[PDB]
Every structure is written in C-alpha cells, then in structure tokens.
Amino acid sequence: SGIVPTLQNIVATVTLGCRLDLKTVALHARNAEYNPKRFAAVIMRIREPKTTALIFASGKMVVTGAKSEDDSKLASRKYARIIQKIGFAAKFTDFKIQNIVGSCDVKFPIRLEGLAFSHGTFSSYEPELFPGLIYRMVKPKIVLLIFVSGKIVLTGAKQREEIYQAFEAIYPVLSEFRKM
DNA sequence: AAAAAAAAAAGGCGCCTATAAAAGGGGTTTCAATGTATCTATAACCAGGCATAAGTACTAAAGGGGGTGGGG
Known part of the structure; x- marks a missing residue:
C-alpha cells in the first residue's frame, strides 16, 4: 500500500x-x-x-x-x-x-455504497445515521470506519500490529472502490 | 416620498450520532408478593301468609229403669 x-x-x-x-x-x-x-x-x-x-x-x-x-x-x-x-x-x-486506535488517508475518494453492497456481511453503511461505513474485519478483529474522503479509522486493536495488518487487508478493497 | 416598525432570513456556534477498550459506588424509578375496608355470590336468618291434619267441644241421637203421687 x-x-x-x-x-x-x-x-x-x-x-x-x-x-x-x-x-x-x-x-x-x-x-x-x-x-x-x-x-x-x-x-x-x-x-x-x-x-x-x-x-x-x-x-x-x-x-x-x-x-x-x-x-x-x-x-x-x-x-x-x-x-x-x-x-x-x-x-x-x-x-x-486495552485498545489502540489509528487513522489513515489513502488520498483518494471512495464509493462507499458500492463497498457496502459488495461486502454486506462485514460493512454497515447508512449515511442517515453516520456518514462513514463501518467495516467489521474478522482477521484481525479490527473495526474500521471508512469515509468518502479516503480517511480511515481503525480501532479495537490490542497490538499496534493489528492496526497495520487491518489496513493492509482493507487497502485492496478500498482501491477497488476508488472513485475515478 | 419619506421615516419607521415588524418580519423573514442568513451566518455562525455548539453538540449529537456511530467507533473504539476498560477499573469501583450511589442515584432514582418500576415492580414483586402479601394484606385493610368493601364488593361479589352463598348459606342461613327471622316473621308473615296459606293449606292439611289432629283434637275439641258441641250438639245430637235413642234406649230404658225406678220411684213417687194420684185415682179407683
């Protein structure tokens, strides 16, 4: 990434x-x-x-x-x-x-509803409630908050390595739904 | 035409939602089973009213014998 x-x-x-x-x-x-x-x-x-x-x-x-x-x-x-x-x-x-939170900026926009429809079992997106998409990753067990801006929030980690591994895992799908 | 007041509207500020994980205490608010005064259907109570059975006294009857007085 x-x-x-x-x-x-x-x-x-x-x-x-x-x-x-x-x-x-x-x-x-x-x-x-x-x-x-x-x-x-x-x-x-x-x-x-x-x-x-x-x-x-x-x-x-x-x-x-x-x-x-x-x-x-x-x-x-x-x-x-x-x-x-x-x-x-x-x-x-x-x-x-007990908890480590980290943030990113992939620099590009993200079509969230396409990402939600694609990964329905892991993501909950309803802009009405909250503007960001909630992705509940299984391995590692990290919750991500994905925004249209490309800004990424990763939380739920106990080791800083989990944040890193969580981000690497999500980057491909983030890229796949890049608005371009 | 002019000044004036009343009105709608804007911009800005602040706080909310969903994200996250984790150490002790005290608050108010709602709900649990277990009981007085009053309610319900039952059971049981008196006094008053009408019909049937038992006992009453009443009148009711007929049958006769005996003794006393009067008449022949």
Whole structure:
C-alpha cells in the first residue's frame, strides 16, 4: 500500500493496588475534577505525555490519550507517582493496553455504497445515521470506519500490529472502490 | 416620498450520532408478593301468609229403669 496508519489513541488500565479516597485525591492533585454525582471516579490530566486518567476508589485506573505504548506506560507511572506523592500506598501494577486506535488517508475518494453492497456481511453503511461505513474485519478483529474522503479509522486493536495488518487487508478493497 | 416598525432570513456556534477498550459506588424509578375496608355470590336468618291434619267441644241421637203421687 505504501502507507502506515498513525496511532492516535491508546487506552490502558493499571491496578495501583490500594484503596483510594477520591475526595482527597481531587483535593490535593492539580487539574483534577471529581463529581461523584455523575461518575464515581477522579478525572485527572497531565501534559507529558498529554493524557487523561480515570482514577477509582478501588485503586484502579484507566489512562487514555496516549499515542504510543511507551507514552502510555510512562503516563501511567506519573499518575501512580502523584497518587503516592499525595499519600497513598499506590504501586504501578498490572499495566495493560486495552485498545489502540489509528487513522489513515489513502488520498483518494471512495464509493462507499458500492463497498457496502459488495461486502454486506462485514460493512454497515447508512449515511442517515453516520456518514462513514463501518467495516467489521474478522482477521484481525479490527473495526474500521471508512469515509468518502479516503480517511480511515481503525480501532479495537490490542497490538499496534493489528492496526497495520487491518489496513493492509482493507487497502485492496478500498482501491477497488476508488472513485475515478 | 419619506421615516419607521415588524418580519423573514442568513451566518455562525455548539453538540449529537456511530467507533473504539476498560477499573469501583450511589442515584432514582418500576415492580414483586402479601394484606385493610368493601364488593361479589352463598348459606342461613327471622316473621308473615296459606293449606292439611289432629283434637275439641258441641250438639245430637235413642234406649230404658225406678220411684213417687194420684185415682179407683
């Protein structure tokens, strides 16, 4: 294909192994918002790497927004370090990436309804609901959002390799339905 | 002809849909079986009204004997 999808977002979970007083975290950490009435967790953001963590009373958290596996682990470590610095027996445990999202640009337009009619068992296209075509790939198990513009969204991957393999697999069919 | 107010219309801003994966708590809202006062059909209750059977007293009858008084 000659193109390599760009990783745009990585979601990871981390068990800090120790109960937390969310009310206290929200009070001593900067850039933290806590509104239990709507979500039972403290939302905290940091600038390097630019990410957002969801911290729970159970001591477990979700780190989002990271653009690489390293930034994800690194950011996760900083959040844990803050929880500690606040006064908890937090530890960096069970780090695990749960989802990777990537995007592409094949540069050419795509006749989506032709692609949907051709691959009916994998794609759901109804512009009324959503402008992009939803392609549910089997191997690897990656969901793609194909747009008329040639823009491609790939998600559902746990290894960055799946995004790459998903894109290579779809390129031929994308090319086949190129508007030209 | 002119100024004036009222109206429709535009452009811009913001947020929504479908995509994605994954760690603990507390909220309101709807629905479960199990019961008072009142309902239903039943069962059972009194007093009042008409017909049949049992007991009543009543009048009803006929049959005779005995004793006393009067007459011959």
